[PDB]
Amino acid sequence: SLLNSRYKLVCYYTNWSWYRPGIGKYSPEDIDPSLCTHIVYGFAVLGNDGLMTAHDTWSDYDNRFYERVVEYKRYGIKVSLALGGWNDSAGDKYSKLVNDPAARAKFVQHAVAFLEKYGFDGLDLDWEYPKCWQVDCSKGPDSDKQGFADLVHELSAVLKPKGLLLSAAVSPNKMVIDAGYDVPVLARLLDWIAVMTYDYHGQWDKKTGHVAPLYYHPDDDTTYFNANYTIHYWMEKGTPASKIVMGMPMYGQSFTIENRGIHGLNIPVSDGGEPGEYTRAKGFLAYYEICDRIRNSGWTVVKDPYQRMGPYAYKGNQWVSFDDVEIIKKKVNFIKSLNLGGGMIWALDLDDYRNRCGQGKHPLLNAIKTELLNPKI
Ligand SMILES: N[C@@H]1[C@@H](O)[C@H](O[C@@H]2O[C@H](CO)[C@@H](O[C@@H]3O[C@H](CO)[C@@H](O[C@@H]4O[C@H](CO)[C@@H](O[C@@H]5O[C@H](CO)[C@@H](O[C@@H]6O[C@H](CO)[C@@H](O[C@@H]7O[C@H](CO)[C@@H](O[C@@H]8O[C@H](CO)[C@@H](O)[C@H](O)[C@H]8N)[C@H](O)[C@H]7N)[C@H](O)[C@H]6N)[C@H](O)[C@H]5N)[C@H](O)[C@H]4N)[C@H](O)[C@H]3N)[C@H](O)[C@H]2N)[C@@H](CO)O[C@H]1O
Numbered sequence: 276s277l278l279n280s281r282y283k284l285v286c287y288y289t290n291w292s293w294y295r296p297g298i299g300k301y302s303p304e305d306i307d308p309s310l311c312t313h314i315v316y317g318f319a320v321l322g323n324d325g326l327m328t329a330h331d332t333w334s335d336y337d338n339r340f341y342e343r344v345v346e347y348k349r350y351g352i353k354v355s356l357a358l359g360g361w362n363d364s365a366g367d368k369y370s371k372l373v374n375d376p377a378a379r380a381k382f383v384q385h386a387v388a389f390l391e392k393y394g395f396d397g398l399d400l401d402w403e404y405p406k407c408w409q410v411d412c413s414k415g416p417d418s419d420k421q422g423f424a425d426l427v428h429e430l431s432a433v434l435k436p437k438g439l440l441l442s443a444a445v446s447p448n449k450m451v452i453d454a455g456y457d458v459p460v461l462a463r464l465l466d467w468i469a470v471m472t473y474d475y476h477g478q479w480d481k482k483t484g485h486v487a488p489l490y491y492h493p494d495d496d497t498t499y500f501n502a503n504y505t506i507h508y509w510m511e512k513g514t515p516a517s518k519i520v521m522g523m524p525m526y527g528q529s530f531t532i533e534n535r536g537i538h539g540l541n542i543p544v545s546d547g548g549e550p551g552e553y554t555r556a557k558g559f560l561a562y563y564e565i566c567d568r569i570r571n572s573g574w575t576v577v578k579d580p581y582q583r584m585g586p587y588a589y590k591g592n593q594w595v596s597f598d599d600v601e602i603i604k605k606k607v608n609f610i611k612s613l614n615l616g617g618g619m620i621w622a623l624d625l626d627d628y629r630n631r632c633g634q635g636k637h638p639l640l641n642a643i644k645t646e647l648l649n650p651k652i
């Protein structure tokens with residue numbers, strides 16, 4: 276079992292996946308307890324009073340979603356609550372908090388009481404990002420770095436004596452890592468660091484690219500935009516391998532390409548791809564939306580024979596890059612070879628949990644589990 280192994284498999288849960296039609300609906304009881312060692316509930320948010328608060332009272336509270344995910348502690352899974360996420364990280368409110376010691380002191384006592392009220396095992400910090408607010412390093416003050424480090428210390432000082440966990444989801448981008456993170460302090464105090472080794476490329480690049488390359492590719496604009504560089508950089512900055520869990524995407528980045536005639540990497544893009552029926556977000560497709568396009572709508576798949584990155588698929592002017600089972604096995608062997616703490620997925624509700632594509636239920640996540648449990652490297 277994963278729980279008896281030397282590896283973590285940290286699964287993000289998202290409360291908003293409930294609000295999807297038909298088979299895209301995901302509920303707490305859809306969580307497969309054999310596939311995760313840790314479940315992280317996305318998200319709670321930062322209230323205007325500087326205190327953590329529920330993001331969606333109808334699900335989290337009225338329909339007892341918090342309690343129904345904390346249910347999984349009964350299997351020996353550790354269940355944490357994540358604070359933040361992309362939308363909540365817009366603007367200055369996390370910076371205002373961490374630069375104000377009085378506000379941090381108030382926040383910390385309330386946050387631990389909040390976790391204990393609902394039975395969470397710990398807190399996951401997902402501020403995107405200290406200093407580089409929503410990856411704009413011109414926006415935030417340098418002092419976000421020390422402020423975040425002191426927030427992590429102050430949370431640790433209250434959580435650790437109670438046996439509660441503290442983790443963070445962190446940038447894979449060199450520039451953001453350098454500006455936002457006091458890596459030695461975080462590495463010492465956090466129980467794990469979930470490196471978000473995905474979203475390296477997307478519609479914002481104005482050209483096609485892979486959501487989550489593992490190794491450098493000769494046509495890359497930089498040597499930094501791949502999981503191999505990112506994970507080694509976190510270690511170079513002072514993170515122990517055992518503290519790192521490597522993120523893997525259960526989804527793809529989609530693109531509307533400018534001309535249907537060329538369809539390779541780095542080709543011009545006019546917009547995000549057309550939204551999926553279930554996830555309804557331009558530029559984004561769940562794995563179960565992608566595999567259906569390939570299986571039943573004739574999308575053409577291009578693989579990398581050197582396995583530096585997963586596949587992409589295209590049809591007409593639509594183009595999506597994503598991870599398949601093959602590249603996932605390669606990434607998990609990479610995790611094992613570096614003796615990392617384990618793997619992480621974003622997110623439970625985006626894998627093909629319903630077996631819509633006939634590859635079995637949870638094909639990507641089961642591929643991770645099987646390779647993590649395989650002794651050979
Ligand atoms: N009541 C119910 C409700 O509950 C429910 O509501 C739901 O709630 C949930 C939760 O809030 C919602 O989910 C969220 O949905 C959103 C989508 O709508 C998601 O948003 C996305 O999030 C992802 C991340 O998770 C974002 O991804 C990021 O995107 C940005 C860009 O947008 C990327 O940032 C860019 O990064 C690149 C590098 O990668 C960087 O480029 C560099 O810039 C530098 C500096 O400028 C350059 O350097 C210079 O270069 C030149 C030459 O090269 C030199 O001369 C210079 O010297 C040099 N300095 C360099 O070239 C580049 N390397 C860019 O600058 C940077 N901007 C970022 O990386 C990427 N991570 C994404 O954008 C978001 N859209 C969100 O994640 C979800 N959680 C849910 O949707 C919501 N509905 C409701 C549901 O129905 O129902 C109610 O009932």
Ligand SMILES: *[C@@H]1O[C@H](CO)[C@@H](O[C@@H]2O[C@H](CO)[C@@H](O)[C@H](O)[C@H]2NC(C)=O)[C@H](O)[C@H]1NC(C)=O
Pocket residue numbers: 490491503504507
């Ligand atoms: C994985 O990433 C690491 C580190 O970024 C690469 O190892 C480096 O190899 C390059 C060759 O230029 C050197 O810059 C460093 O001297 C190496 N560092 C270490 C610690 O070996 C490694 O090449 C990358 N792997 C692949 C397969 O691309």
